């Protein structure tokens, strides 16, 4: 009846990645009022669906970490996580740089250790 | 009980990984009725539970995806796929290739830029 | 005076990772009692979330698996499995080799063929 057809089919050979790209951007806002500080670092070029908890790490240049301003959520579908948090100013004295790290959950923990970070 | 026994473990000298082997094989089969067009797609060898999106894309190898062939399915688990799909002859008048490619979702984007291609 | 700093963040350089390190060790206790054998396997260091099967191969290194002593089970959050099953003497009797492997299911499946394996 109709014209047929049945050709085999052949392996490509450079099959190369599609979809986003990794490459981590990123803004920081560190707004203070009378005595808590809102911060908004609005990342871009992330990985796709991670989670990306950041916070303040202390001098130490691996240091301890005011936990107190973690923040977790997650990073959209082309990688455009926006962390966002309040920390009275008191507990962030002697902060130094804030660290964006990976997570394994939304329940912090750490995955990676410094996927980007900016003095202040 | 009457018997015991102590064993500790040793990691063996090579682990080998087991199940499917990623050879991607593929059998194309067109039936184009009136103004109509079947292609049943059976890709043997593939990844164990991955998305195969299969396009018919135009002269231009390189060019542009006829989005309106599009077939999606599930490889199984051992990597078996079978795409069917109905298309219009007249849409499809310019295709030269069948470029079968990775998803990243059911019914979406390309996760990849063609694995398996035939030439039409 | 909403005191308000911007900042670039830098993308980092060092993202080594954060959490439990696969370095597969552990243990075995086979008991036997009236004809009954309870064999436990205690394994720390493994993969941190993932089904471990493990069998009794016989001797032949290759050697069939008396399959009739499957023992699945998952791991914690720090890489912790405990195997445990319970298979008549007579049943294991010429087996040679105690084999952990990785289960691609909870219904069993050998991805990997032997993480780590104890001589019995």
Redesign the interface.
């Known amino acids: ?12 050979a450079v ?5 986003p790209v990794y ?11 009378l005595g808590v500080t809102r911060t908004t ?1 609005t ?1 871009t070029g992330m990985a796709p669906y991670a989670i990306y908890v950041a916070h303040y790490h202390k001098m130490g240049s691996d240091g301890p970490a005011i936990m107190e301003s973690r923040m977790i959520a997650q990073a959209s579908a082309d990688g455009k996580v926006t962390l966002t948090g309040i920390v009275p100013t008191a507990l962030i004295r002697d902060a130094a740089y ?1 660290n ?2 990976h997570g ?1 959950d939304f329940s912090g ?12």
Request: net charge neutral; with cysteine.
């Open positions: 009846g109709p014209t047929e057809g049945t050709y085999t089919l052949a392996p490509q099959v190369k990645p599609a979809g490459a981590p951007a990123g803004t920081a806002k560190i707004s203070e009022t670092i990342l804030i964006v790290h394994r923990a750490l995955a990676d250790s410094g996927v980007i970070c900016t003095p202040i």
